[PDB]
Amino acid sequence: FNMQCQRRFYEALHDPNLNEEQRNAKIKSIRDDC
C-alpha cells in the first residue's frame, strides 16, 4: 500500500466504463496485490 495503490483505487472508483461487478473486482485486485 502506497501512492500507486491510492491512485489505482481512486481511478478504479472513478471509472464509468466499468460496471459494478468489474469495478469491485478491480478494487479487490488492487487491494489483494497491495
mmCIF file of all heavy atoms in Angstrom:
data_model
loop_
_atom_site.group_PDB
_atom_site.id
_atom_site.type_symbol
_atom_site.label_atom_id
_atom_site.label_comp_id
_atom_site.label_asym_id
_atom_site.label_seq_id
_atom_site.Cartn_x
_atom_site.Cartn_y
_atom_site.Cartn_z
ATOM 1 N N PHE A 1 0.831 -1.217 0.000
ATOM 2 C CA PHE A 1 0.000 0.000 0.000
ATOM 3 C C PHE A 1 0.862 1.261 0.000
ATOM 4 O O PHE A 1 1.616 1.494 0.942
ATOM 5 C CB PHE A 1 -0.982 0.005 1.175
ATOM 6 C CG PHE A 1 -1.987 -1.131 1.138
ATOM 7 C CD1 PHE A 1 -1.800 -2.276 1.936
ATOM 8 C CD2 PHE A 1 -3.098 -1.053 0.279
ATOM 9 C CE1 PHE A 1 -2.733 -3.327 1.890
ATOM 10 C CE2 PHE A 1 -4.024 -2.107 0.228
ATOM 11 C CZ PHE A 1 -3.844 -3.244 1.034
ATOM 12 N N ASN A 2 0.748 2.067 -1.063
ATOM 13 C CA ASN A 2 1.487 3.309 -1.248
ATOM 14 C C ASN A 2 0.763 4.187 -2.277
ATOM 15 O O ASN A 2 -0.397 3.934 -2.602
ATOM 16 C CB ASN A 2 2.942 3.001 -1.649
ATOM 17 C CG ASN A 2 3.044 2.351 -3.028
ATOM 18 O OD1 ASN A 2 3.258 3.036 -4.027
ATOM 19 N ND2 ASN A 2 2.896 1.027 -3.085
ATOM 20 N N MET A 3 1.451 5.217 -2.788
ATOM 21 C CA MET A 3 0.922 6.176 -3.747
ATOM 22 C C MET A 3 0.298 5.495 -4.966
ATOM 23 O O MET A 3 -0.774 5.904 -5.408
ATOM 24 C CB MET A 3 2.035 7.134 -4.195
ATOM 25 C CG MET A 3 2.545 8.008 -3.046
ATOM 26 S SD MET A 3 3.816 9.200 -3.545
ATOM 27 C CE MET A 3 4.111 10.010 -1.953
ATOM 28 N N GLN A 4 0.957 4.469 -5.519
ATOM 29 C CA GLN A 4 0.454 3.781 -6.702
ATOM 30 C C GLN A 4 -0.897 3.125 -6.413
ATOM 31 O O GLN A 4 -1.809 3.214 -7.229
ATOM 32 C CB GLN A 4 1.500 2.795 -7.246
ATOM 33 C CG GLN A 4 1.580 1.480 -6.460
ATOM 34 C CD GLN A 4 2.855 0.711 -6.788
ATOM 35 O OE1 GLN A 4 2.827 -0.250 -7.553
ATOM 36 N NE2 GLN A 4 3.977 1.132 -6.204
ATOM 37 N N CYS A 5 -1.027 2.487 -5.245
ATOM 38 C CA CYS A 5 -2.234 1.792 -4.826
ATOM 39 C C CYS A 5 -3.368 2.792 -4.619
ATOM 40 O O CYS A 5 -4.481 2.554 -5.079
ATOM 41 C CB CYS A 5 -1.943 0.981 -3.560
ATOM 42 S SG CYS A 5 -0.607 -0.226 -3.780
ATOM 43 N N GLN A 6 -3.078 3.914 -3.946
ATOM 44 C CA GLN A 6 -4.018 5.008 -3.740
ATOM 45 C C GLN A 6 -4.573 5.498 -5.080
ATOM 46 O O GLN A 6 -5.788 5.555 -5.260
ATOM 47 C CB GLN A 6 -3.321 6.122 -2.941
ATOM 48 C CG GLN A 6 -4.248 7.292 -2.575
ATOM 49 C CD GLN A 6 -4.506 8.243 -3.745
ATOM 50 O OE1 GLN A 6 -3.568 8.758 -4.349
ATOM 51 N NE2 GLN A 6 -5.778 8.482 -4.073
ATOM 52 N N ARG A 7 -3.683 5.845 -6.017
ATOM 53 C CA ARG A 7 -4.050 6.334 -7.340
ATOM 54 C C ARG A 7 -4.867 5.293 -8.112
ATOM 55 O O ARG A 7 -5.864 5.644 -8.740
ATOM 56 C CB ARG A 7 -2.787 6.736 -8.110
ATOM 57 C CG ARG A 7 -2.201 8.036 -7.541
ATOM 58 C CD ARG A 7 -0.860 8.379 -8.194
ATOM 59 N NE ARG A 7 0.189 7.438 -7.779
ATOM 60 C CZ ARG A 7 1.461 7.479 -8.210
ATOM 61 N NH1 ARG A 7 1.853 8.398 -9.104
ATOM 62 N NH2 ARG A 7 2.351 6.593 -7.744
ATOM 63 N N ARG A 8 -4.456 4.020 -8.065
ATOM 64 C CA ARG A 8 -5.163 2.922 -8.712
ATOM 65 C C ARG A 8 -6.585 2.778 -8.160
ATOM 66 O O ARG A 8 -7.520 2.631 -8.945
ATOM 67 C CB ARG A 8 -4.369 1.620 -8.570
ATOM 68 C CG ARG A 8 -3.177 1.593 -9.537
ATOM 69 C CD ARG A 8 -2.208 0.460 -9.186
ATOM 70 N NE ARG A 8 -2.875 -0.849 -9.187
ATOM 71 C CZ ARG A 8 -3.131 -1.596 -10.274
ATOM 72 N NH1 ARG A 8 -2.807 -1.164 -11.502
ATOM 73 N NH2 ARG A 8 -3.719 -2.791 -10.132
ATOM 74 N N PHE A 9 -6.759 2.827 -6.831
ATOM 75 C CA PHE A 9 -8.077 2.784 -6.204
ATOM 76 C C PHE A 9 -8.934 3.950 -6.692
ATOM 77 O O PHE A 9 -10.053 3.737 -7.149
ATOM 78 C CB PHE A 9 -7.972 2.829 -4.671
ATOM 79 C CG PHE A 9 -7.498 1.561 -3.986
ATOM 80 C CD1 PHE A 9 -6.509 1.631 -2.984
ATOM 81 C CD2 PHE A 9 -8.213 0.361 -4.166
ATOM 82 C CE1 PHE A 9 -6.212 0.504 -2.201
ATOM 83 C CE2 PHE A 9 -7.924 -0.761 -3.374
ATOM 84 C CZ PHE A 9 -6.930 -0.688 -2.385
ATOM 85 N N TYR A 10 -8.408 5.177 -6.592
ATOM 86 C CA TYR A 10 -9.097 6.397 -6.990
ATOM 87 C C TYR A 10 -9.592 6.304 -8.438
ATOM 88 O O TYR A 10 -10.757 6.585 -8.715
ATOM 89 C CB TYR A 10 -8.148 7.580 -6.774
ATOM 90 C CG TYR A 10 -8.745 8.946 -7.046
ATOM 91 C CD1 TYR A 10 -9.643 9.516 -6.126
ATOM 92 C CD2 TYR A 10 -8.331 9.687 -8.169
ATOM 93 C CE1 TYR A 10 -10.094 10.835 -6.304
ATOM 94 C CE2 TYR A 10 -8.796 11.001 -8.356
ATOM 95 C CZ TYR A 10 -9.674 11.577 -7.421
ATOM 96 O OH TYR A 10 -10.119 12.853 -7.604
ATOM 97 N N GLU A 11 -8.710 5.887 -9.353
ATOM 98 C CA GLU A 11 -9.042 5.672 -10.754
ATOM 99 C C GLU A 11 -10.153 4.627 -10.894
ATOM 100 O O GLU A 11 -11.160 4.897 -11.540
ATOM 101 C CB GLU A 11 -7.774 5.264 -11.520
ATOM 102 C CG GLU A 11 -8.039 4.922 -12.993
ATOM 103 C CD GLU A 11 -8.751 6.050 -13.736
ATOM 104 O OE1 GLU A 11 -8.155 7.147 -13.811
ATOM 105 O OE2 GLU A 11 -9.878 5.796 -14.216
ATOM 106 N N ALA A 12 -9.966 3.445 -10.293
ATOM 107 C CA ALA A 12 -10.899 2.327 -10.374
ATOM 108 C C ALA A 12 -12.304 2.720 -9.917
ATOM 109 O O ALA A 12 -13.279 2.368 -10.579
ATOM 110 C CB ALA A 12 -10.362 1.154 -9.553
ATOM 111 N N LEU A 13 -12.410 3.454 -8.801
ATOM 112 C CA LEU A 13 -13.668 4.012 -8.325
ATOM 113 C C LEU A 13 -14.290 4.884 -9.414
ATOM 114 O O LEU A 13 -15.446 4.685 -9.787
ATOM 115 C CB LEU A 13 -13.445 4.845 -7.051
ATOM 116 C CG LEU A 13 -13.095 4.015 -5.804
ATOM 117 C CD1 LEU A 13 -12.675 4.962 -4.674
ATOM 118 C CD2 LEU A 13 -14.274 3.156 -5.328
ATOM 119 N N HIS A 14 -13.518 5.850 -9.921
ATOM 120 C CA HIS A 14 -13.987 6.833 -10.885
ATOM 121 C C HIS A 14 -13.771 6.317 -12.311
ATOM 122 O O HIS A 14 -13.068 6.947 -13.098
ATOM 123 C CB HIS A 14 -13.260 8.161 -10.633
ATOM 124 C CG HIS A 14 -13.242 8.597 -9.188
ATOM 125 N ND1 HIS A 14 -14.261 8.316 -8.289
ATOM 126 C CD2 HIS A 14 -12.280 9.238 -8.450
ATOM 127 C CE1 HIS A 14 -13.865 8.766 -7.085
ATOM 128 N NE2 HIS A 14 -12.667 9.347 -7.120
ATOM 129 N N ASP A 15 -14.386 5.170 -12.640
ATOM 130 C CA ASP A 15 -14.269 4.537 -13.949
ATOM 131 C C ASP A 15 -15.656 4.122 -14.464
ATOM 132 O O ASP A 15 -16.024 2.953 -14.351
ATOM 133 C CB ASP A 15 -13.299 3.348 -13.847
ATOM 134 C CG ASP A 15 -12.879 2.785 -15.203
ATOM 135 O OD1 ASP A 15 -13.488 3.183 -16.221
ATOM 136 O OD2 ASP A 15 -11.942 1.958 -15.199
ATOM 137 N N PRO A 16 -16.424 5.063 -15.046
ATOM 138 C CA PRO A 16 -17.745 4.816 -15.617
ATOM 139 C C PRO A 16 -17.776 3.700 -16.666
ATOM 140 O O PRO A 16 -18.806 3.050 -16.832
ATOM 141 C CB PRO A 16 -18.180 6.144 -16.246
ATOM 142 C CG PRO A 16 -17.414 7.184 -15.437
ATOM 143 C CD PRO A 16 -16.091 6.475 -15.162
ATOM 144 N N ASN A 17 -16.660 3.488 -17.379
ATOM 145 C CA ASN A 17 -16.546 2.481 -18.430
ATOM 146 C C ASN A 17 -16.833 1.076 -17.897
ATOM 147 O O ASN A 17 -17.370 0.244 -18.625
ATOM 148 C CB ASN A 17 -15.153 2.520 -19.074
ATOM 149 C CG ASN A 17 -14.761 3.922 -19.535
ATOM 150 O OD1 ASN A 17 -15.139 4.351 -20.621
ATOM 151 N ND2 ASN A 17 -13.998 4.641 -18.707
ATOM 152 N N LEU A 18 -16.481 0.818 -16.630
ATOM 153 C CA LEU A 18 -16.722 -0.454 -15.971
ATOM 154 C C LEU A 18 -18.094 -0.426 -15.299
ATOM 155 O O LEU A 18 -18.581 0.638 -14.921
ATOM 156 C CB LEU A 18 -15.633 -0.699 -14.916
ATOM 157 C CG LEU A 18 -14.202 -0.698 -15.477
ATOM 158 C CD1 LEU A 18 -13.222 -0.971 -14.329
ATOM 159 C CD2 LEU A 18 -14.001 -1.740 -16.584
ATOM 160 N N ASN A 19 -18.705 -1.605 -15.136
ATOM 161 C CA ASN A 19 -19.916 -1.767 -14.342
ATOM 162 C C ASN A 19 -19.533 -2.067 -12.889
ATOM 163 O O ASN A 19 -18.350 -2.092 -12.550
ATOM 164 C CB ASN A 19 -20.832 -2.835 -14.966
ATOM 165 C CG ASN A 19 -20.255 -4.252 -14.969
ATOM 166 O OD1 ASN A 19 -19.580 -4.668 -14.032
ATOM 167 N ND2 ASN A 19 -20.528 -5.011 -16.031
ATOM 168 N N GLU A 20 -20.535 -2.291 -12.034
ATOM 169 C CA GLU A 20 -20.340 -2.540 -10.613
ATOM 170 C C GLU A 20 -19.427 -3.744 -10.377
ATOM 171 O O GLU A 20 -18.462 -3.639 -9.627
ATOM 172 C CB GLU A 20 -21.706 -2.725 -9.938
ATOM 173 C CG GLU A 20 -21.571 -2.894 -8.421
ATOM 174 C CD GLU A 20 -22.941 -3.008 -7.760
ATOM 175 O OE1 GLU A 20 -23.461 -4.144 -7.723
ATOM 176 O OE2 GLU A 20 -23.445 -1.958 -7.307
ATOM 177 N N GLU A 21 -19.732 -4.881 -11.009
ATOM 178 C CA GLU A 21 -19.029 -6.141 -10.803
ATOM 179 C C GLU A 21 -17.555 -5.996 -11.185
ATOM 180 O O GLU A 21 -16.672 -6.326 -10.394
ATOM 181 C CB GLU A 21 -19.693 -7.267 -11.612
ATOM 182 C CG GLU A 21 -21.099 -7.638 -11.113
ATOM 183 C CD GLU A 21 -22.145 -6.543 -11.327
ATOM 184 O OE1 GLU A 21 -22.115 -5.922 -12.412
ATOM 185 O OE2 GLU A 21 -22.955 -6.341 -10.396
ATOM 186 N N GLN A 22 -17.302 -5.492 -12.399
ATOM 187 C CA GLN A 22 -15.972 -5.237 -12.930
ATOM 188 C C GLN A 22 -15.180 -4.319 -11.999
ATOM 189 O O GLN A 22 -14.048 -4.632 -11.639
ATOM 190 C CB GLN A 22 -16.094 -4.588 -14.312
ATOM 191 C CG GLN A 22 -16.630 -5.548 -15.379
ATOM 192 C CD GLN A 22 -16.852 -4.807 -16.696
ATOM 193 O OE1 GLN A 22 -17.632 -3.859 -16.751
ATOM 194 N NE2 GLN A 22 -16.166 -5.228 -17.759
ATOM 195 N N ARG A 23 -15.776 -3.186 -11.616
ATOM 196 C CA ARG A 23 -15.156 -2.196 -10.750
ATOM 197 C C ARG A 23 -14.777 -2.806 -9.401
ATOM 198 O O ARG A 23 -13.631 -2.677 -8.982
ATOM 199 C CB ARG A 23 -16.097 -0.997 -10.622
ATOM 200 C CG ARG A 23 -15.614 0.053 -9.613
ATOM 201 C CD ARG A 23 -16.323 1.397 -9.828
ATOM 202 N NE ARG A 23 -17.770 1.233 -10.033
ATOM 203 C CZ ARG A 23 -18.420 1.282 -11.210
ATOM 204 N NH1 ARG A 23 -17.780 1.552 -12.357
ATOM 205 N NH2 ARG A 23 -19.738 1.054 -11.242
ATOM 206 N N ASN A 24 -15.715 -3.482 -8.728
ATOM 207 C CA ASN A 24 -15.462 -4.136 -7.447
ATOM 208 C C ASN A 24 -14.352 -5.183 -7.565
ATOM 209 O O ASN A 24 -13.516 -5.284 -6.670
ATOM 210 C CB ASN A 24 -16.751 -4.756 -6.887
ATOM 211 C CG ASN A 24 -17.611 -3.724 -6.158
ATOM 212 O OD1 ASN A 24 -17.667 -3.721 -4.930
ATOM 213 N ND2 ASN A 24 -18.284 -2.842 -6.897
ATOM 214 N N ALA A 25 -14.327 -5.952 -8.661
ATOM 215 C CA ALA A 25 -13.254 -6.901 -8.931
ATOM 216 C C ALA A 25 -11.907 -6.184 -9.074
ATOM 217 O O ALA A 25 -10.896 -6.677 -8.577
ATOM 218 C CB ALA A 25 -13.582 -7.730 -10.175
ATOM 219 N N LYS A 26 -11.890 -5.022 -9.739
ATOM 220 C CA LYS A 26 -10.693 -4.210 -9.924
ATOM 221 C C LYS A 26 -10.168 -3.733 -8.562
ATOM 222 O O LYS A 26 -8.990 -3.911 -8.258
ATOM 223 C CB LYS A 26 -11.006 -3.043 -10.879
ATOM 224 C CG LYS A 26 -9.834 -2.638 -11.782
ATOM 225 C CD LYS A 26 -8.593 -2.213 -10.991
ATOM 226 C CE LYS A 26 -7.530 -1.559 -11.882
ATOM 227 N NZ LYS A 26 -7.949 -0.230 -12.361
ATOM 228 N N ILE A 27 -11.045 -3.146 -7.734
ATOM 229 C CA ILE A 27 -10.731 -2.718 -6.373
ATOM 230 C C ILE A 27 -10.141 -3.887 -5.579
ATOM 231 O O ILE A 27 -9.102 -3.738 -4.940
ATOM 232 C CB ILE A 27 -11.991 -2.140 -5.692
ATOM 233 C CG1 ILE A 27 -12.524 -0.871 -6.385
ATOM 234 C CG2 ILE A 27 -11.757 -1.863 -4.199
ATOM 235 C CD1 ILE A 27 -11.649 0.373 -6.217
ATOM 236 N N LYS A 28 -10.800 -5.051 -5.628
ATOM 237 C CA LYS A 28 -10.361 -6.261 -4.951
ATOM 238 C C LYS A 28 -8.955 -6.668 -5.406
ATOM 239 O O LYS A 28 -8.128 -7.026 -4.572
ATOM 240 C CB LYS A 28 -11.397 -7.367 -5.188
ATOM 241 C CG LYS A 28 -11.135 -8.612 -4.334
ATOM 242 C CD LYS A 28 -12.066 -9.784 -4.683
ATOM 243 C CE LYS A 28 -13.559 -9.486 -4.483
ATOM 244 N NZ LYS A 28 -14.174 -8.858 -5.668
ATOM 245 N N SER A 29 -8.679 -6.605 -6.716
ATOM 246 C CA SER A 29 -7.374 -6.936 -7.277
ATOM 247 C C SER A 29 -6.286 -6.002 -6.741
ATOM 248 O O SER A 29 -5.231 -6.476 -6.324
ATOM 249 C CB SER A 29 -7.422 -6.906 -8.808
ATOM 250 O OG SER A 29 -8.380 -7.824 -9.290
ATOM 251 N N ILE A 30 -6.542 -4.684 -6.741
ATOM 252 C CA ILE A 30 -5.616 -3.694 -6.197
ATOM 253 C C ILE A 30 -5.328 -4.018 -4.731
ATOM 254 O O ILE A 30 -4.168 -4.081 -4.333
ATOM 255 C CB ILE A 30 -6.175 -2.264 -6.346
ATOM 256 C CG1 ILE A 30 -6.319 -1.876 -7.827
ATOM 257 C CG2 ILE A 30 -5.241 -1.252 -5.652
ATOM 258 C CD1 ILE A 30 -7.302 -0.718 -8.018
ATOM 259 N N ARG A 31 -6.382 -4.219 -3.934
ATOM 260 C CA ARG A 31 -6.283 -4.452 -2.502
ATOM 261 C C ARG A 31 -5.503 -5.728 -2.188
ATOM 262 O O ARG A 31 -4.663 -5.729 -1.292
ATOM 263 C CB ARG A 31 -7.696 -4.480 -1.910
ATOM 264 C CG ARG A 31 -7.692 -4.347 -0.381
ATOM 265 C CD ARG A 31 -9.065 -3.872 0.104
ATOM 266 N NE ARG A 31 -9.323 -2.492 -0.340
ATOM 267 C CZ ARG A 31 -10.511 -1.973 -0.691
ATOM 268 N NH1 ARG A 31 -11.644 -2.683 -0.583
ATOM 269 N NH2 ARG A 31 -10.563 -0.718 -1.158
ATOM 270 N N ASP A 32 -5.773 -6.804 -2.934
ATOM 271 C CA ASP A 32 -5.075 -8.074 -2.809
ATOM 272 C C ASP A 32 -3.583 -7.901 -3.108
ATOM 273 O O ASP A 32 -2.743 -8.316 -2.314
ATOM 274 C CB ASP A 32 -5.720 -9.097 -3.753
ATOM 275 C CG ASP A 32 -5.018 -10.450 -3.679
ATOM 276 O OD1 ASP A 32 -5.318 -11.196 -2.721
ATOM 277 O OD2 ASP A 32 -4.192 -10.714 -4.579
ATOM 278 N N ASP A 33 -3.267 -7.284 -4.253
ATOM 279 C CA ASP A 33 -1.902 -7.049 -4.709
ATOM 280 C C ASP A 33 -1.111 -6.213 -3.698
ATOM 281 O O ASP A 33 -0.018 -6.600 -3.290
ATOM 282 C CB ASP A 33 -1.953 -6.361 -6.079
ATOM 283 C CG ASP A 33 -0.558 -6.011 -6.591
ATOM 284 O OD1 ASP A 33 0.121 -6.942 -7.075
ATOM 285 O OD2 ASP A 33 -0.197 -4.818 -6.486
ATOM 286 N N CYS A 34 -1.668 -5.061 -3.312
ATOM 287 C CA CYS A 34 -1.030 -4.087 -2.437
ATOM 288 C C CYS A 34 -0.981 -4.556 -0.981
ATOM 289 O O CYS A 34 -0.076 -4.171 -0.244
ATOM 290 C CB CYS A 34 -1.765 -2.750 -2.560
ATOM 291 S SG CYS A 34 -1.594 -1.972 -4.189
#
